[PDB]
């Protein structure tokens, strides 16, 4: 399935996507992407839209 990440940062705003077998694996990949770009925050997940949001 395709999952989306919305980044609502102070200095960085955008969206990205990844392909994964389950929501948990998409979580490990997205936490890595956020760390490589300097974003840190609180995580939320909406199972109906397969979307993870990180708000700083």
Curated annotation (Swiss-Prot):
It is found in: Secreted, Cell wall. It comes from the Bacteria. Sequence repeats lie at residues 3-56. Binds to the constant Fc region of IgG with high affinity. This is Immunoglobulin G-binding protein G. The chain holds residues 299 to 352 of 448 of the full protein.
């Amino acid at each position: 399935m395709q999952y989306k990440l919305v980044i609502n940062g102070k200095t960085l705003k955008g969206e990205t996507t990844t392909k994964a077998v389950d929501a948990e694996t998409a979580e490990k990949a997205f936490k890595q992407y956020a760390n490589d770009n300097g974003v840190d925050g609180v995580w939320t997940y909406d199972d109906a839209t397969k979307t993870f949001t990180v708000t700083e």
